Amino acid sequence: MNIFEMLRIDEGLRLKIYKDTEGYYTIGIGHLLTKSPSLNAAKSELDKAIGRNTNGVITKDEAEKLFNQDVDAAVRGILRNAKLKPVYDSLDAVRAAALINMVFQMGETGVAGFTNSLRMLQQKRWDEAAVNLAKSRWYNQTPNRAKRVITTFRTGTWDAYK
């Protein structure tokens, strides 16, 4: 299993414009279109993204394609990010996916704010990191995802996903 499969699980697949849980226009596999309340705006952002006039509708392939860009971007940010990189560097193939899942979900800045958990991970203090991550807003709010990702950092296995 890998980051793609994991996120596809976490984000689901929607081929028609939807609203994320903050009310933001979204599509596909967690592709945020715009933070504008204007549906016209998101449709316009979409067409721009796809390269065609979609009418707020995309194909599974178009989605997979945006998905790929998104994942790549998430990895780059981690890498451009100063708090992140060193953590990414200390993590195994599996736990690295988990980190990436968080960045994708909350953004560079968002993830870089888990100050204690990040040092704990950095130190390979799994359980404790886990213990602490569970004490977040993030987890309270998206407990299903949070839990899986937390179990991922703790075990270094795909169990929570199997």
Curated annotation (Swiss-Prot):
GO terms for biological process: cell wall macromolecule catabolic process; defense response to bacterium; peptidoglycan catabolic process; viral release from host cell by cytolysis. SUPFAM superfamilies: Lysozyme-like. Substrate binds at residues 32, 104, 117, 132. Changing residue 20 to A/N/S/T: Complete loss of enzymatic activity. Changing residue 117 to F: 10-fold decrease in enzymatic activity. Its main location: host cell. Optimum pH is 7.3. Keywords: Antimicrobial, Bacteriolytic enzyme, Cytolysis, Glycosidase, Host cell lysis by virus, Host cytoplasm, Hydrolase, Viral release from host cell. This is Endolysin. It comes from Enterobacteria phage T4.
